[PDB]
């Protein structure tokens with residue numbers, strides 16, 4: 001209610017005590033703020049990192065010292081640019097360069113020539129992603145000056161059962177020859193030599209119509225199969241088609257593994273199959289294709 | 299004296315209210331900073347599995363099958379190591395390499411010269427439970443890298459922005475080049491077309507004469523608050539276009555637009571909000587005027603094919 | 605002007621200055637806190653109410669006159 005005009009001198013001298021105090025605190029606050037700004041300049045930590053160790057291939061790298069699987073940069077001797085890959089390094093010190101992977105169906109494999117040439121999908125440090133490295137890369141790797149390579153095919157059903165098929169002298173040719181697939185011989189494996197053909201009984205030429213050694217790569221937009229029609233298209237994928245296949249790892253990913261002829265408007269057997277192991281109406285749950293210098297495959 | 303002495307008391311009561319009020323707002327702020335300091339004892343994280351397909355830049359990648367907009371790895375030139383970048387493969391026929399992106403204020407842009415040289419921010423982040431980072435983070439690729447990409451060959455620049463009301467306009471530059479560091483990353487643009495307003499080449503629409511001219515960025519040099527290379531030729535340390543907390547840009551005297559300005563929430567901001575009263579902040583005068591901070595701002599480049 | 609009536613003129617401006625200074629600190633802190641979003645585990649969700657600052661300012665410009 002308006003007090004003595006004699007208090008004003010203390011009251012006035014009071015608002016000053018809480019004024020300078022305020023400015024004081026504000027200064028320390030700003031300091032505190034400077035410190036906060038410092039703890040906020042960095043970017044989020046990316047779990048996925050790439051190792052520095054490089055080489056002509058995973059083996060070359062593994063030998064150099066790398067000991068764990070993970071993404072790496074390799075550059076085969078004749079390659080222009082270097083390119084990222086997924087290396088698998090076991091205890092024995094074998095660097096496997098993986099170029100094909102299936103495990104969930106998240107990645108569509110109904111791609112064209114270019115994409116199959118360049119590669120698609122994602123690379124992951126924990127080999128938990130699906131992909132196709134790219135015909136050109138695979139080619140470069142498998143045809144390094146005087147280095148016999150070996151291809152291992154690992155399968156796995158919807159029951160935790162795995163199998164492997166190995167091929168010695170694995171090779172993939174240049175685009176001039178449509179990335180022709182070739183190998184010297186089936187180097188063994190409980191998975192079964194599906195690349196040699198398989199007799200179904202539908203025709204007397206089955207074996208002939210389903211062999212893969214020597215077959216050129218095909219995609220819907222680039223027919224190179226031994227069929228008057230289009231294998232890659234019908235199955236909706238990219239692969240070394242004959243007429244059409246006995247072993248087909250880039251097939252449609254049928255969840256459950258078990259599919260039938262009543263799965264398409266044509267009854268095609270366009271799944272992830274490998275005749276020697278399971279029936280043609282069983283699409284694998286996992287699929288991995290890796291290579292490594294033959295002179296290392298035990 | 300008599301009644302004027304009545305202001306004094308009612309006056310003391312006022313200030314008393316404020317000084318004790320602020321002293322509390324301070325208390326609030328202090329509390330707030332201590333909390334954020336604790337959340338910073340640990341970082342944010344990402345898991346960006348790298349796509350297989352790669353190339354010299356986004357254009358080559360899309361021509362190689364990369365059709366989805368996400369983070370890619372590119373090796374512009376064989377001398378330098380491959381680096382992550384975000385590729386816009388949908389906007390106007392895709393093949394756009396993002397070199398600058400603003401959208402939420404998650405990243406600080408008021409950095410020194412070195413960081414604008416190397417790059418900073420977050421390129422990409424993981425989208426709704428996915429092993430690949432399909433959304434772009436806020437970032438500046440880094441002067442060196444931008445200089446190299448634009449020189450590789452004829453490069454066009456696409457600038458996109460959005461206001462806090464959902465509106466969108468674009469700024470296109472048929473020709474865009476940024477020189478190397480020795481040349482202070484001097485910028486050159488041309489062949490405009492768009493709806494955002496040609497602020498880089500012409501200058502602020504609101505200005506006239508030498509004023510609308512001294513706000514022209516084309517031909518300017520790059521400056522950061524710790525490295526003056528602007529149009530202001532004087533010794534007055536108080537006239538520099540880039541002050542603390544301000545971003546690095548191609549400042550003149552001083553700007554028509556600043557994609558690298560402070561991220562003010564809401565859009566409109568005033569002189570008593572700005573650290574220096576100067577108007578830093580994601581501006582593009584030719585469309586929203588002088589004191590408006592965009593909600594989204596991005597800079598994308600693509601090899602120019604006539 | 606008497607001594608006391610002159611010590612007030614000083615404060616009025618002082619607070620007006622400290623108000624602007626706080627208004628600024630407020631925005632600065634908001635911007636910086638948000639910029640921790642891209643570096644730290646999380647960012648303190650907040651919202652500044654410039655309104656109170658906008659009121660205390662006028663409320664003070666009037667009493668100064």
Ligand SMILES: *[C@@H]1O[C@H](CO)[C@@H](O)[C@H](O)[C@H]1NC(C)=O
Nearest residue numbers: 504505506507508509510511
């Ligand atoms: C340039 O700026 C000065 C100072 O603000 C002003 O006096 C002059 O009128 C401006 N030029 C224009 C746009 O007329």
Ligand SMILES: [Ca+2]
Nearest residue numbers: 223227228229
């Ligand atoms: Ca055919």
Ligand SMILES: [Ca+2]
Nearest residue numbers: 406408409410
């Ligand atoms: Ca800074």
Ligand SMILES: [Ca+2]
Nearest residue numbers: 526528530531
């Ligand atoms: Ca200067």
